[PDB]
């Protein structure tokens, strides 16, 4: 009859409020069936895991509620407690876990969360774009499991809107001089910047962007939660549109919501038959719960309409569904609430949006540099290619009608032979396509960089250097 619920918490106030919450859940539903047992966090790594596993397995605990950080900021993720509880496939609900390590269901079997992960930041970009009416996205994401998951989710949700990402750049952790990626981003016509990395990576990017012309005007900086805290606030230029989650910080509220969720599950556990007694002795039992997947099915099929946050729904990942989003604009290094999203509805605040640029109008992510580089194959009847004069220009000839023969400066290799140094020397090329290019320039503003073919062939499918590859030549 007695069911034990465990938690790894530091402060005694959290234990007291958990006891009050479970007592209220028993009052709100007959007989007493819930017992409270909590343990304290330790600075160790393996010793604390052994202690909590010994105190937990020998106590017949069904539900686990552990906050992700034991301190305001540390790397002590609650991986060991979940892994110890996974021996018998014990359902675990995360209080403030947000790293994507727990997101995948392949490794984690019965370890869910009570708060949405960072993956929802990828989905909210679509909500931002459908309001700002943009079509170009440039991604600045570090190399980690969270980054890979965000990239995969964004690609899956973007491939259905007939839009494709222009360029994807990778941030190697620990790097300091990454100005090459910023230069590549500058050399792109689109000026929409999306960043999702750690605090150190964000600071490193901002240090370069301070000197570089990446925040002057015509740029938008949409970043995640991790860049609205720490040194990011004091080293972030104004106009950055941040993201935050409402009611996602109160540990007491999270514990109350978790207790409310588990209250229905405790009562629904006895509804189904074929229930087995919880294991008491840690040593001497290596069995598997028959109702393991049944608990997950019941939790997924359950619906909740009460709580501090509000309606709670579980998706296939096991986290909250249709979470509330808030836009935290950065104006004079001060957080300003602008946009509120419930998943489908848009509720913008009456305060005007202050862009990082001087103008308050919405920037356009379409900056055509008009530097259309054109490469023309060396064809005798179509383009006359001759060496240029040593004075610096090319001689001008005339046709039978006496009209001048217009020509453009062309740059290409001279030797054009394998195993030879193909020095880039400008040449004098003209022909049928030169007149068409001149007409195009007259009709619309065009600038031409007349390149030449690298090898000398149009190029077809190439299958070399491995078992299977296809690269155009």
């Amino acid at each position: 009859k007695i069911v034990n619920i465990g938690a790894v918490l530091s402060t005694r106030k959290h234990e007291q409020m958990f006891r009050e919450a479970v007592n209220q859940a028993n009052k709100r539903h007959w007989k007493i069936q819930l017992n409270a047992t909590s343990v304290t966090h330790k600075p160790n790594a393996i010793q604390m895991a052994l202690s909590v596993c010994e105190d937990l397995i020998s106590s017949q605990v069904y539900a686990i509620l552990v906050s992700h950080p034991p301190t305001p900021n540390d790397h002590f993720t609650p991986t060991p407690v979940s892994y110890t509880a996974g021996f018998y496939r014990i359902p675990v609900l995360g209080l403030t876990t947000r790293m994507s390590i727990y997101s995948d269901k392949s490794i984690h079997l019965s370890f869910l969360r009570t708060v949405p992960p960072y993956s929802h930041q990828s989905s909210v970009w679509f909500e931002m774009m459908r309001v700002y009416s943009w079509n170009h996205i440039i991604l600045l994401v570090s190399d980690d499991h969270e980054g890979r998951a965000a990239q995969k989710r964004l690609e899956t949700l973007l491939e259905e809107r007939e839009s494709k990402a222009e360029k994807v750049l990778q941030f190697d952790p620990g790097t300091k001089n990454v100005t090459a990626l910023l230069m590549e981003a500058k050399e792109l016509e689109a000026r929409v910047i999306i960043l999702s990395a750690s605090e150190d990576d964000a600071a490193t990017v901002y240090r370069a962007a301070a000197m570089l012309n990446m925040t002057g005007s015509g740029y938008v900086w949409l970043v995640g939660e991790r860049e609205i805290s720490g040194n990011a606030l004091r080293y972030a230029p104004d106009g950055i549109l941040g993201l935050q989650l409402i009611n996602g910080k109160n540990e007491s509220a999270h514990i109350s919501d978790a207790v409310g969720v588990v209250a229905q599950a405790v009562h629904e556990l006895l509804e189904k038959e074929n229930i087995t007694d919880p294991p008491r002795g840690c040593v001497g039992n290596t069995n598997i719960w028959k109702t393991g997947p049944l608990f997950k099915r019941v939790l997924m099929s359950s619906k909740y309409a009460d709580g501090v946050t509000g309606r709670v729904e579980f998706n296939e990942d096991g986290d909250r569904k249709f979470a509330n989003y808030s836009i935290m604009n950065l104006q004079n290094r001060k957080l300003v609430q602008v946009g509120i999203y419930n998943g489908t509805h848009v509720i913008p605040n009456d305060r005007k949006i202050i862009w990082p640029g001087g103008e308050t109008e919405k920037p356009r992510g379409y900056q055509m540099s008009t530097r259309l580089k054109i490469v023309t194959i060396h064809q005798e009847p179509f383009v006359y290619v001759k060496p240029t004069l040593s004075d610096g220009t090319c001689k001008e000839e005339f046709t039978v009608n006496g009209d001048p023969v217009k020509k453009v400066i062309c740059t290409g290799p001279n030797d054009t032979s394998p195993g030879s140094p193909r020095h880039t020397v400008p040449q004098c090329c003209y022909g049928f396509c030169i007149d068409l290019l001149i007409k195009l320039a007259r009709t619309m503003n065009f600038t031409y960089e007349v390149h030449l073919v690298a090898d000398g062939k149009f190029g077809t499918q190439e299958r070399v250097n491995n078992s299977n590859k296809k690269e155009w030549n």
């Binding site: 600075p43 160790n44 790594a45 393996i46 010793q47 895991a49 052994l50 596993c53 010994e54 397995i57 991986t79 060991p80 892994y83 110890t84 996974g86 021996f87 390590i101 995948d104 269901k105 392949s106 490794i107 499991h145 995969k152 899956t156 840690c282 040593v283 001497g284 290596t286 296939e316 499918q461 299958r463 078992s467 299977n468 590859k469 296809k470």
Partner: protein, 469 residues
């Protein structure tokens, strides 16, 4: 230095210790002292495992642990993440958690399993299709995790492929226990090969449903990965015969041989470490004290797993610990409900098969299909000329039917080697045109006994002689 080996309940510990010691005795003489501490225990509890590994690292300073356990629990591999990320000790395994590897995390861990890589299995799954000459596919997946990566990988490898695979539109099943939308999703099948990415129970349920839905015919093909198969001793009655599966089985390679290979790999890694340095780093002295930040300044063997070779076999590990040259034993479910080895994928990442096509018999005791009409051809260069195949990782160039010709080894032995050869002819075009009208398949069967046929004492030879009997 000292490497401890932990195994489940097995033969007496003395024999296992002798087998482990026989490693350095045979070859690879090294001045480093190799000491092995073998332990046997039924229990596999997490706290017990932590205490045992702490005792092993405290006593004699064990620098390597390999856990070959017969337990079917999938969390055995995950239980050692703390040990790998804190004690900086290489981690190996044979069975149990190491049998199937799917955990990807930070590179601070020292996990290096001998199991088949989850992404690498698709390469063999497509190469067997290429060898069997079926370019049409039906990619059927589920909401189970670890399959979106499969979809991305197969899309990437068919977009970059120059063979010309007829990638039919995929059907992504949502969940089981529907009975109303599954038929709607599966009614669009029109190919002959269907994949399945689910669990064991889900696969059994979907095959049972397809039995009533008529999708278990003698013409369809089913490819199943190693996840559903798993152990090769339980054969549910819902699995039709002729199923094609690929896994990492130990039919030929023994646990002792795998332990010897792992010990050799570890010794080679230690020898390579001793080249650029001069001392072997040691882990923490005590399991209960934390007097320093657990950093990694000793330059551990994490990047040194690439240039490790043992017994003349290239046994390397990628950045994720995946084996570069796994085994990938192919198992086919026979009509007697057993798994038989067909293909091996050990030599130069190349696989060969015994070429046993007919495996469809006695499924529902009905529809005795006989559409596999054998076609006999005669070598007639003006009309039907055959030749070799240029090496381009392909079998058919554009539309040629695969010609399987029996080739004799020499003038003494008598074995018909099954070698595919490219063949073009007017009769081939006639057969191709007739196929679109008769709507049936025709597998060519070239012959070499005789040319036309005579009457030598009322005996028929040649193509006529072969077709008479």
């Amino acid at each position: 230095l000292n490497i401890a080996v932990m195994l489940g309940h097995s033969h007496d510990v003395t024999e296992r210790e002798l087998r482990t010691l026989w490693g350095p005795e045979q070859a690879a003489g090294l001045p480093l002292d190799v000491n092995v501490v073998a332990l046997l225990m039924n229990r596999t509890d997490p706290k017990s495992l932590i205490t045992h590994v702490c005792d092993l690292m405290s006593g004699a300073r064990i620098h390597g642990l390999v856990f070959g356990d017969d337990t079917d629990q999938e969390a055995v591999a995950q239980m050692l993440d703390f040990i790998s990320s804190h004690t900086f000790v290489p981690i190996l395994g044979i069975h149990g958690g190491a049998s199937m590897i799917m955990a990807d995390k930070d590179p601070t861990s020292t996990f290096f399993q001998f199991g088949a890589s989850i992404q690498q299995q698709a390469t063999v799954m497509l190469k067997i299709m290429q060898d069997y000459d079926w370019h049409v596919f039906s990619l059927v997946t589920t909401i189970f995790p670890g399959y979106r990566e499969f979809i991305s990988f197969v899309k990437t490898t068919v977009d970059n492929s120059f063979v010309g695979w007829d990638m039919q539109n995929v059907i992504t099943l949502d969940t089981s226990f529907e009975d109303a939308k599954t038929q709607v999703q599966l009614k669009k099948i029109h190919s002959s090969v269907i994949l399945l990415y689910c669990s064991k129970d889900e696969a059994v349920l979907i095959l049972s449903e397809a039995r009533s839905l008529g999708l278990t015919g003698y013409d369809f093909f089913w490819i199943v990965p190693s996840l559903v198969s798993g152990n090769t001793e339980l054969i549910p009655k819902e699995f039709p015969s002729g199923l094609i599966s690929v896994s990492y089985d130990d039919w030929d390679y023994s646990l002792e041989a795998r332990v010897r290979d792992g010990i050799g790999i570890l010794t080679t890694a230690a020898s390579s470490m001793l080249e650029k340095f001069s001392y072997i780093p040691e882990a923490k002295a005590s399991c209960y004290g934390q007097m320093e930040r657990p950093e990694v300044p000793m330059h551990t063997l994490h990047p040194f797993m690439v240039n490790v070779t043992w017994d003349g076999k290239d046994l390397s590990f990628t950045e994720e610990g995946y084996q570069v040259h796994p085994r990938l034993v192919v198992i086919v479910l026979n009509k007697d409900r057993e798994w038989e080895k067909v293909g091996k994928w050990e030599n130069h990442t190349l696989s060969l098969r015994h070429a046993v096509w007919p495996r469809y018999k006695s499924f529902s005791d009905c529809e005795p299909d006989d559409n596999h009409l054998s076609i006999v051809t005669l070598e007639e260069a003006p009309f039907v000329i055959v030749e070799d195949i240029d090496p381009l990782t392909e079998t058919c160039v554009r539309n040629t039917v695969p010609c399987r010709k029996f080739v004799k080894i020499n003038n003494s032995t008598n074995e018909g080697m099954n070698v595919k050869k490219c063949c073009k002819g007017f009769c081939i075009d006639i057969l191709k045109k007739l196929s679109r009208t008769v709507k049936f398949t025709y597998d060519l069967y070239l012959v070499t006994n005789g040319k036309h046929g005579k009457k030598v004492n009322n005996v028929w030879n040649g193509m006529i002689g072969e077709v008479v009997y």
